[PDB]
Amino acid sequence: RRRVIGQRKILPDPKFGSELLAKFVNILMVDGKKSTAESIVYSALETLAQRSGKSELEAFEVALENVRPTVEVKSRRVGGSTYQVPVEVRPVRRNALAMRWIVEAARKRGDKSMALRLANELSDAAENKGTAVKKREDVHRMAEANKAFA
Amino acid sequence: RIRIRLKAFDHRLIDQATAEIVETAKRTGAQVRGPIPLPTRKERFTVLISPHVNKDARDQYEIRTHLRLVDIVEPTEKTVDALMRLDLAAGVDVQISL
């Protein structure tokens, strides 16, 4: 409201070393079972290996690049009407937005295990396809189509 | 040997109590395990205040019951009653059996 904060970081990657990566393990983590999150966010790259090849490190971020937006809109009421003024999202929440929408679809795959339900979307990005990547450009639709605002 | 389990709702009946309880038998000195603190059995009691409905209120309490061990090892018959007979206590409770 009238106060300001910084950020709530935590223990990074268990070994591959990657602070932000933790989010992918947290954001996805449910019922506070991080002990299992590491069992999914890690085993995931162990499967994309043969899938992609090059360091799973890049593999992630690689396709991830085709999932992170860069411009959204925020409802702002004025004189009764509430415009949808656009706004370019900084990297901080950008990368986050992706992970959210990414892990989501993965849990909507509706197949069997998540380990695979996760890799699919992790690669579906680069090759382009899936619900996750969908939102990416889907957001672009609302974007600019309202450029008449901001 | 003789034990003396203490228990009171305050230190008043323990502080200046257990102490004298130790320097009573052994007017000069003796074995006796010696005084000790120990945990604290607490029984929290919660109750509803306002009569009729308003069960969302309540008021909790807790009877803090303190204790001490002590326990004498050498039953020096020359100091036994030097503690038992000298059983004042402003209404405490100290067990004694083996």
Add this chain to the structure above:
Amino acid sequence: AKQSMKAREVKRVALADKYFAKRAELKAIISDVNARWNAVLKLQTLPRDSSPSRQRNRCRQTGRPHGFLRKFGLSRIKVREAAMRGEIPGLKKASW
């Protein structure tokens, strides 16, 4: 509460201090496998208005058959009200 009720209950108490005070087992042993007849179990018409499970509490001070405290004997109103003054050794309002 209600004196008329309070007393009605008092009866339900004394009876235990009589029949159940001992004769309660005078038939109990003959109730569980301890061969073993049924006559006693049949002519079992001694404990009527008397039962170790028909006695209520009611705030000792007052007589409310609800909100009772074993460690005490009164109900929330009296207990709290009394504790406030100090008619109970070591009973300060709890607050961890």
Add this chain to the structure above:
Amino acid sequence: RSLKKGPFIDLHLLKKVEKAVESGDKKPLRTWSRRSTIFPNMIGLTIAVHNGRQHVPVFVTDEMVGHKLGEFAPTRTYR
């Protein structure tokens, strides 16, 4: 019904039922203990189970045992 080993019954009735069974029969026996397990000896006896207002004359067949006079007697109201 559920009485493990040795079902429960109210002597009050036992000293009224068979007490009047020996000598032929007569008028309906006004029961009252709906909590009593029906006896296979009180077979088709002319009685009546209290329903909180009056008593309903009911009889048991060679298929009702663990049941109590309460069962074969309504104590509420609906419809």
Add this chain to the structure above:
Amino acid sequence: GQKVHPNGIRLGIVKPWNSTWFANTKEFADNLDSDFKVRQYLTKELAKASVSRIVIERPAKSIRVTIHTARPGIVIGKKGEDVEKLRKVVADIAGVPAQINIAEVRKPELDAKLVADSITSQLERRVMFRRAMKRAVQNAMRLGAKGIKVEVSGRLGGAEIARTEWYREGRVPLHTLRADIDYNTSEAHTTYGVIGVKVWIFKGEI
């Protein structure tokens, strides 16, 4: 209820109890009754005795007690007569031969219940609550008091609508733990109702 009991949360510090001894689920039960029973009969008679508090202890199979009366003389009577008579009441209403004694209370016009039971009677005595509480009650101030006050109840006088009068002197910050204030009440059954009393006597902080 906006303000709670200024005496309740005080048994810990700056304020002593009223029945310090010991008891478990077993004795505490019968014990809670005892302390009550006595204070009931004792008061009724010790009424005109000007009581302030009735402490109760228990060394072993017997109670101690400490009738805090502003004038134990009446409690004595024919020298021992009165006291003795009541000294038996406890031994019978306690179940065990209990001791006894008192400790006169000087400066009674600066004691909660004492002052409370004081202004509560004046009513039946046909007096003007206001002109009384703002005078024949605030007297404690005279005794170099630090702060005091009294808050009556409803049905004041011949009114048919309950209310509450103010009138107060000094400072009675019933929020300061160390402060320490003497609190008590008295339901002076009025000829036409049942008014209440609330005396706040704060004598020095900690």
Add this chain to the structure above:
Amino acid sequence: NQYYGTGRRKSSAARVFIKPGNGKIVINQRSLEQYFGRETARMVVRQPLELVDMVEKLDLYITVKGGGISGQAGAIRHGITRALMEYDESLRSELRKAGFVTRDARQVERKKVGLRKARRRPQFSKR
């Protein structure tokens, strides 16, 4: 020498036995991985050692008591740090910089009489 390490946090309480040399750990008649290991990133025990090495340097054999999983091992962390002063009471200014000397002040929260769980309260539709 027989050093000591508090390592007592989050309802837990360990005992960092810092022996001379031998960077081996044996908490509760078992080694690190031979217990809580393989369940969490509990390997954070060497995290403090990541400033001056160990092994032949010192020993980190511990043994915790009471508390929860992540708590026990986690306690040792905040303990081992301060448990290295007997080797250099001036090297402490190299542990807190990575969250160590500071006891995990964060603990459970007393359930308040009136809330589902000392924070959250039931819904009120007809409100």
Add this chain to the structure above:
RNA sequence: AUGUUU
């Protein structure tokens, strides 16, 4: 919009 109730 009203409430002695668009």
Add this chain to the structure above:
RNA sequence: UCGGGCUCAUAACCCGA
């Protein structure tokens, strides 16, 4: 028409049948 929601409550409005 009815059942639910919206409001302090009505109508209106929204949902469902």
Add this chain to the structure above:
RNA sequence: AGAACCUUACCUGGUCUUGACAUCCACGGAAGUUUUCAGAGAUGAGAAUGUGCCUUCGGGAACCGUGAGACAGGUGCUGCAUGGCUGUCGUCAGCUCGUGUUGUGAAAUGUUGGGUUAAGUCCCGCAACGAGCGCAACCCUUAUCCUUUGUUGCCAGCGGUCCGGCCGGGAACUCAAAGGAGACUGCCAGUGAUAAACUGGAGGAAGGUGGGGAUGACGUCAAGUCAUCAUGGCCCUUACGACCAGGGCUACACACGUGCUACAAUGGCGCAUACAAAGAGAAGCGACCUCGCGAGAGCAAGCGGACCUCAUAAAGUGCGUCGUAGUCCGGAUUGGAGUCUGCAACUCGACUCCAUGAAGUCGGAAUCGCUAGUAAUCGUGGAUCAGAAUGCCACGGUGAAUACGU
């Protein structure tokens, strides 16, 4: 915080009328005891037995029954007659008062204002000067370190060891728990009126009221409670009083609020396994071993408890597996059989056994909670309590996201 009886106020019926509960007067009888019959019981009428305390002998002390009244009894009505208690905005920062002064007055000022703060917080200014209630403190508790005490608690160097803190032993360690140490814009820099204060820093376990408790101003809603209890008035008086048995509060053709469990593979079931905190307890917790598929039943020790029993944490972990099926999910429902707590479980109890396996595949309009050890999830204990917790109270395990901005 606990409705089978009881509770229990409600009902159908049985029954009573100075009473179920009080004092008191008078009479007879110590009080009682166990039984008999008949009753649903409430009772009624008996059969024997028991023969207390004193007496300047009548009398009396309790007490039992009866007689008679003065009286007694009423969870009966007014919460607009009331006490006491509580909810409510609101943990809001407010609410006032004395003196002086301004105005005919009602009132105003202070308390407004400039900064600042979580804050009528602090400073500055000012016809204002001061003060009271309230926010800030002292109380608790947690985060550290020390002192002492070391048994039932502890186990490090020493040996012993049936290798079990199991022996001695050692008081080192965690721990326990009484007394303290500490945090205070206290210190450094900048900003800022060189004011307050703010923003970074050091040091420290801990920073800028450290975190969580408790604490709820003058008051408003004639807000709630005569049913806790108390009480003004009013009302009932072979009764709105009283006692007993059965029934009801556990209805249902519907509607709403708060909840519990799933719809599943971040899962289910089988294996083995990894670890907490706080409390409980003699008409109590009840180990151990035997039998039982099972609830549990038998035997019986230990502990009134840092000594024993409750206690065998659950998530978690590693394997068998099953493969997205309404199923290897989910568990309602129901049938037959049993256990127990109890006079007593049809009406109306908790659990177990086998059989049956529901709806339900994530939920419209709308709506709620939560800023961190929180939300979330997983277990544990307490209270009330004969015996029926998806509730309440409390404990810890693990353990997030997000916060531009009004």
